[PDB]
Design an enzyme around this catalytic site. Structure first.
Site, PDB file in Angstrom:
ATOM      1  N   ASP A   1       0.782  -1.133   0.008  1.00  0.00           N
ATOM      2  CA  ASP A   1       0.067   0.044  -0.026  1.00  0.00           C
ATOM      3  C   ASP A   1       0.758   1.097  -0.079  1.00  0.00           C
ATOM      4  O   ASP A   1       1.707   1.381   0.836  1.00  0.00           O
ATOM      5  CB  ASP A   1      -0.860  -0.025   1.172  1.00  0.00           C
ATOM      6  CG  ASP A   1      -2.196   1.076   1.055  1.00  0.00           C
ATOM      7  OD1 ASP A   1      -1.991   1.952   0.278  1.00  0.00           O
ATOM      8  OD2 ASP A   1      -2.953   0.769   1.894  1.00  0.00           O
TER       9      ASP A   1
ATOM     10  N   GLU B   1      30.620  12.086   1.227  1.00  0.00           N
ATOM     11  CA  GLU B   1      30.995  12.068   2.557  1.00  0.00           C
ATOM     12  C   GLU B   1      29.849  12.865   3.407  1.00  0.00           C
ATOM     13  O   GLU B   1      30.041  14.110   3.536  1.00  0.00           O
ATOM     14  CB  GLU B   1      32.486  12.455   2.751  1.00  0.00           C
ATOM     15  CG  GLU B   1      32.734  13.969   2.380  1.00  0.00           C
ATOM     16  CD  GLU B   1      33.659  13.845   1.389  1.00  0.00           C
ATOM     17  OE1 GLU B   1      33.437  12.835   0.267  1.00  0.00           O
ATOM     18  OE2 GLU B   1      34.523  14.753   1.174  1.00  0.00           O
TER      19      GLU B   1
ATOM     20  N   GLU C   1      28.308  13.758   7.327  1.00  0.00           N
ATOM     21  CA  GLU C   1      28.835  13.590   8.627  1.00  0.00           C
ATOM     22  C   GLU C   1      27.651  13.681   9.706  1.00  0.00           C
ATOM     23  O   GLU C   1      26.431  14.105   9.343  1.00  0.00           O
ATOM     24  CB  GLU C   1      29.695  15.061   8.870  1.00  0.00           C
ATOM     25  CG  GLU C   1      30.944  15.108   8.288  1.00  0.00           C
ATOM     26  CD  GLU C   1      30.939  16.521   7.501  1.00  0.00           C
ATOM     27  OE1 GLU C   1      30.170  17.323   7.569  1.00  0.00           O
ATOM     28  OE2 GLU C   1      32.128  16.678   7.315  1.00  0.00           O
TER      29      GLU C   1
ATOM     30  N   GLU D   1      34.996  14.903  13.835  1.00  0.00           N
ATOM     31  CA  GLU D   1      34.776  16.170  12.928  1.00  0.00           C
ATOM     32  C   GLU D   1      34.986  17.360  13.878  1.00  0.00           C
ATOM     33  O   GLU D   1      35.564  17.200  14.790  1.00  0.00           O
ATOM     34  CB  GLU D   1      33.324  15.708  12.401  1.00  0.00           C
ATOM     35  CG  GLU D   1      33.604  15.567  10.956  1.00  0.00           C
ATOM     36  CD  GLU D   1      34.058  16.654   9.807  1.00  0.00           C
ATOM     37  OE1 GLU D   1      34.266  17.967  10.444  1.00  0.00           O
ATOM     38  OE2 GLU D   1      34.500  16.258   8.627  1.00  0.00           O
TER      39      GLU D   1
ATOM     40  N   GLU E   1      32.602  11.370  11.322  1.00  0.00           N
ATOM     41  CA  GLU E   1      32.529  11.267  10.008  1.00  0.00           C
ATOM     42  C   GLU E   1      32.938   9.907   9.676  1.00  0.00           C
ATOM     43  O   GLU E   1      34.037   9.455  10.372  1.00  0.00           O
ATOM     44  CB  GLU E   1      33.039  12.175   8.988  1.00  0.00           C
ATOM     45  CG  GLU E   1      33.045  12.118   7.618  1.00  0.00           C
ATOM     46  CD  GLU E   1      34.361  12.191   6.608  1.00  0.00           C
ATOM     47  OE1 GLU E   1      35.318  11.900   7.487  1.00  0.00           O
ATOM     48  OE2 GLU E   1      34.107  12.283   5.660  1.00  0.00           O
TER      49      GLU E   1
ATOM     50  N   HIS F   1      29.874  16.266   1.328  1.00  0.00           N
ATOM     51  CA  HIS F   1      30.781  16.702   0.292  1.00  0.00           C
ATOM     52  C   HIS F   1      30.779  15.631  -0.746  1.00  0.00           C
ATOM     53  O   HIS F   1      31.031  14.488  -0.391  1.00  0.00           O
ATOM     54  CB  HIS F   1      32.026  16.863   0.908  1.00  0.00           C
ATOM     55  CG  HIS F   1      31.858  17.707   2.036  1.00  0.00           C
ATOM     56  ND1 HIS F   1      31.494  18.893   1.919  1.00  0.00           N
ATOM     57  CD2 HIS F   1      32.888  17.757   3.202  1.00  0.00           C
ATOM     58  CE1 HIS F   1      31.652  19.574   3.297  1.00  0.00           C
ATOM     59  NE2 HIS F   1      32.416  18.574   3.942  1.00  0.00           N
TER      60      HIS F   1
ATOM     61  N   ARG G   1      38.982  28.101   0.472  1.00  0.00           N
ATOM     62  CA  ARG G   1      37.890  27.753   1.407  1.00  0.00           C
ATOM     63  C   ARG G   1      36.633  28.290   1.042  1.00  0.00           C
ATOM     64  O   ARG G   1      35.454  27.912   1.467  1.00  0.00           O
ATOM     65  CB  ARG G   1      38.371  27.745   2.866  1.00  0.00           C
ATOM     66  CG  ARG G   1      39.207  26.771   3.336  1.00  0.00           C
ATOM     67  CD  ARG G   1      39.669  26.796   4.468  1.00  0.00           C
ATOM     68  NE  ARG G   1      40.481  28.181   4.719  1.00  0.00           N
ATOM     69  CZ  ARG G   1      41.717  28.333   4.625  1.00  0.00           C
ATOM     70  NH1 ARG G   1      42.342  27.260   4.415  1.00  0.00           N
ATOM     71  NH2 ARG G   1      42.296  29.327   4.950  1.00  0.00           N
TER      72      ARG G   1
ATOM     73  N   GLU H   1      34.453  18.276  -6.638  1.00  0.00           N
ATOM     74  CA  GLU H   1      33.497  18.012  -5.467  1.00  0.00           C
ATOM     75  C   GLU H   1      32.729  19.009  -5.096  1.00  0.00           C
ATOM     76  O   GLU H   1      33.124  20.288  -4.916  1.00  0.00           O
ATOM     77  CB  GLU H   1      34.654  17.988  -4.219  1.00  0.00           C
ATOM     78  CG  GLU H   1      33.720  18.035  -2.784  1.00  0.00           C
ATOM     79  CD  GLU H   1      35.023  17.796  -1.721  1.00  0.00           C
ATOM     80  OE1 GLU H   1      36.177  17.364  -2.152  1.00  0.00           O
ATOM     81  OE2 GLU H   1      34.739  18.231  -0.732  1.00  0.00           O
TER      82      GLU H   1
ATOM     83  N   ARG I   1      30.658  21.039  -2.500  1.00  0.00           N
ATOM     84  CA  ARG I   1      30.703  20.930  -1.036  1.00  0.00           C
ATOM     85  C   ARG I   1      29.342  21.599  -0.326  1.00  0.00           C
ATOM     86  O   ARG I   1      29.116  21.268   1.070  1.00  0.00           O
ATOM     87  CB  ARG I   1      31.748  21.685  -0.432  1.00  0.00           C
ATOM     88  CG  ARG I   1      33.045  20.877  -0.394  1.00  0.00           C
ATOM     89  CD  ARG I   1      34.154  21.681   0.137  1.00  0.00           C
ATOM     90  NE  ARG I   1      33.730  22.432   1.424  1.00  0.00           N
ATOM     91  CZ  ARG I   1      34.403  23.307   2.149  1.00  0.00           C
ATOM     92  NH1 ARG I   1      35.822  23.451   1.708  1.00  0.00           N
ATOM     93  NH2 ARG I   1      33.983  23.830   3.176  1.00  0.00           N
TER      94      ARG I   1
END
Lengths: 436, 439, 433
Positions: free
Chosen positions: A48, A121, A123, A204, A212, A261, A321, A339, A341
């Site tokens: 269902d 990845e 966390e 982390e 992580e 990430h 960053r 990647e 992020r």
């Protein structure tokens, strides 16, 4: 058939069928192991679908995903299943697994490559207890953790040792200060039992037990399955240890939240299309992929950040960053990848991966350059994300991967949930406006 | 005999004779195993039937229902018994199992078919702790469960982990949110130990621990026995784990109750009579069965919804049929073969007596088939137990056909249910304090 | 102007404009007394009525009474609701409906100034706790004189004198825990011009008391019923207790009902009085017959609470002697005070609505010459009968169809809300079944 082989080998007693709904939460239903036969794979199992949020339909089990379960007392075999509408005998239009499979098929159809490798990845937070409630009388989300920074006084049964990470200072304490070494080892054990290839596990940035566990790569659908398996394994290992695990993007203030990430690669006929002559060894296809992600970042935020909690946490480079996208350092051209992020662990892995792939394929098809390395950024609020997705939905619909009806229904669901959150009084409003 | 063979093989020491009263509760008497012989099956056992309402009576064991008991330290063999009046030596008039057997015999007599197949899906609730009381000083009721949606702050001996299904949001969480997977597995193991064939087991929509364990189909009386055995198994498995099973149809407010869907089919010489070329591949026999269930649905609510609480759940109330429109309380489940063609009635609730409810549904379907009642392509079930009893009193005509439901038994059941209904109705409700304290 | 005289006499500082919503809960809004001028009575005071379930407050000058509970000298004026669009009475105002009922009674020529005297019983509880959520439905009553506290603990001691179950009809004040409190309520009634007739303990334990006051015309008597409710509630609050006007707040004990004595006057002569049965005229017999005929429909107004049908005096027949009869003829020494007492109405009824419904049913019986069947057993049944038999209410334009529709919708929402919750007795029976 892997399922019957495993059943014979481990003399299992239960078959746990699983799938995923629109919100990304896995769903499971158990049947006796003696019910498996050719009919069980020819016709699946009826169930269902009305009671499930966002949706008489069929769980068609996936043979290739059969895997033993390390948490059930009796030997149980977990089988992830696709969802089939009986009227059409095809994958359900709103089934996230079906959407991911359609995305893979479109990627093959365009010829940009054969399969796309995704490794996320995520966390998580390992708390001891969580007491949350928000009703008319008021709200509360109190968090209890032995290794939390703020717990430097609270007397604990069996002793209160003074070792515990500080705020934003839980990045690789030795296990005198890192309280979660053995629990992370047990989570990795359970991950390895369920067929996952654990790559690394550590603490982390955040206090209160942010950990992580990064696992290996896989193709799109297989990696979504592996992410769901990782969530299930860490949740049950924490539960068996007497703790709780949260995958919320940010369950705290100030301290960095939880992010997913997602490393991304595309292979075409056995070779990597993300390696070549370019910035940090990126080919033209990789640049076009990053440009497509940048162009449709706000649109993608509807899937990669499909939660009001995602924006309590919220360019491509190799050291900067500031960049929301990273080109990680690798040793071989075949391992070259990008990647993203910004995506968070609360995202529906199938929908998130499919949307990201669609945006990147649009960028490659249109040959959109992301400019030089390191500024448009992610959206601000969930309402803004949903509006951008509603008025910026063209690449998902193109190629027949995401249907217009599915996206409209999913937007309605997320919009009603965001309205539910946005109209509730915040205790900060009491802190700032009470004596007005 | 099967019972003697089981006794010899398993070295059992006790025989537990069980039957069912009018209210649908099983009732058991234990004797030593050494006191079993041919004479035991010939003459049964005298017992007092005065304090049950259905004077000396005879317990005649049904050898075909012998099974072992996994909940006892000593090896115990459970035998479901029939109640026999010593004066007539026939089946008792008010014995529910006798009524189900008479329903099977009437089905054979009509020539419509034989060995009607019933499969129910009684959902239940698993509570860690339940407290209730009612007297002049007041009426109190509260249910404690670790997985409750309202328990998101409660202190627990083991910590308040934040994973728990929300209101109307318990349909298939994974185990780390579904608190009741191991207990469901244990219930399934106990069911397999009593000869039942479990097909599926999972959480249900409501929070606070609503679960469903489906079991394979069977004939009328056999399936009623299997339903009683399933209730026994889940009750005792929960009691062994420190928890309780609740089978009353609606033990909460604002969340889905517990319903017992009943899938009905009728066989004829090994062929299925419901398979045809009508709507959803239903033979005209199936359509007339649907019409009979629809016409007598209000009367059926007296037996399939005996609880005054069941109508706190029926607030699946459409008495129509469809395979897609979920408003209707009669559904034609999708099947992969005409051999499994069947109808499904969703209004019955687990508080019903299995024998009485199944017999009532079968007699309604048989009346519809005999009178060629065509349902069509709107009627509603009763809104309160008083209305259901009134409708049953007015329209007991189909039940009495063939002498299955006697008028005396119907009147006794009506009187008993009316006493319960007036007991519940004439008591103050705390919502009346919410509404009227300041008038 | 009575209000200006009272303000000058008592140096009143505040005015309480009071009206009554469809549910019968008296409503009040306070304004300063210095704003009372002839313009205030001429044009009323605007207020927002879109929030009350079911305009201009036009004060009724003749009903200005001092308030004995305010710490400052305060006046109270009962106000009619007037629609600004038409400057006429609001169609859904119980006071307006009652006034229309008296207008119709005067118009039809049967009589003038229908006399209503209700006897409502109330409960005095020390404490009351209740709640109803998904977790549970809890209800509990705390009372020192409660018959179930015979072994309880109290601060300062537990004296053993308290009435038993159904045994509270006039113990002496050693057992009658509420003599001083009853006298205080009587004083509060007398401080706003209420002619108290009798006050005593009633049958039920846990503090059921009745304070019967004098008679009046229908609108005046409804105003006096609301005044009695206000005074009794506030005196119990002042004494540290609570008063419940619910029809049945207990189980295993008696309930509380508003026994309504009704009569009809005509130029100073009692029309009910006669030489028929129990000295009732043919007009009184027709009144009783009309009430009996429309009794199920009347139950929607006289017993609007779901709790009322826990209390349900059900047989709708007249008798001066029989006790099961729900329309008794109380004895009276002199024929000028002949009246008929209907016992099914309860204190949770809107006084205006209940009295108007009873009067309209009686007048319908008078006009139809009906000459002589139980009351409804549930609120849903009562509302169904009310919808079926609304014709006599709409006769004369007293009860408009729109108002009856709104009242039915509101009471149906209430009844459905209380009807879909799990009674604890349902656990007591069906938990293990």
């Amino acid at each position: 058939s892997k399922s019957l082989q495993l059943i014979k080998e481990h003399d299992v007693k239960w078959i746990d069928l699983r799938f995923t709904d629109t919100k990304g939460k896995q769903q499971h239903v158990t049947m006796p192991a003696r019910d498996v036969d050719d009919d069980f794979f020819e016709y699946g199992k009826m169930f269902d679908g009305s009671s499930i949020a966002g949706w008489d339909m069929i769980l068609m089990p996936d043979d290739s995903t059969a895997v033993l379960d390390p948490f059930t007392e009796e030997p149980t075999l977990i089988i992830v299943c696709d969802i089939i509408e009986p009227s059409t005998m095809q994958g359900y239009d709103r089934d996230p697994r079906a959407i991911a499979r359609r995305a893979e098929e479109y990627l093959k159809s365009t010829g940009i490559g054969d399969t796309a490798f995704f490794g996320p990845e995520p966390e998580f937070f390992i708390f001891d207890e969580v007491k949350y409630k928000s009703d008319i009388s008021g709200s509360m989300f109190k968090i209890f953790s032995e290794q939390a920074a703020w717990n430097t006084d609270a007397d604990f049964e069996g002793g209160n040792k003074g070792h515990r990470p500080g705020v934003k200072g839980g990045y690789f304490p030795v296990p005198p200060v890192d309280h979660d070494h053995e629990i992370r080892t047990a989570m990795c054990n359970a991950l390895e039992e369920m067929g996952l290839k654990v790559e690394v596990h550590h603490h982390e940035v955040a206090t209160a037990g942010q950990n992580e566990i990064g696992v290996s790569f896989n193709t799109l659908v297989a990696k979504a399955d592996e992410v769901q398996t990782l969530k299930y394994c860490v949740h049950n290992v924490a539960d068996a240890y007497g703790k709780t695990v949260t995958f919320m993007p940010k369950p705290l203030y100030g301290d960095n939240g939880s992010g997913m990430h997602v490393h991304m690669s595309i292979a075409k006929d056995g070779k990597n299309t993300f390696a070549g002559e370019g910035y940090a060894g990126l080919s033209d296809t990789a640049l076009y992929f990053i440009g497509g992600i940048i162009k449709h970042g706000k649109a993608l935020n509807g899937f990669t950040n499909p939660s009001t909690n995602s924006y309590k946490r919220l360019a491509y480079s190799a050291r900067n960053r500031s960049a929301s996208i990273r080109i990680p350092y690798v040793n071989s051209p075949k391992a070259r990848r990008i990647e993203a992020r910004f995506p968070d662990p609360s995202a529906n892995p199938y929908l998130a991966f499919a949307a990201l792939l669609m945006a990147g394929l649009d960028g490659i098809q249109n040959k959109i350059h992301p400019g030089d390395a390191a500024i448009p950024q992610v959206c601000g609020s969930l309402k803004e994300a949903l509006e951008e997705l509603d008025k910026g939905r063209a690449f998902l619909t193109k190629g027949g991967v995401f249907s217009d009806d599915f996206i409209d229904a999913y937007l309605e669901l997320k919009s009603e949930e965001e309205i539910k959150v946005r109209t509730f009084v915040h205790p900060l409003e009491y802190d700032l406006y009470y004596s007005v």
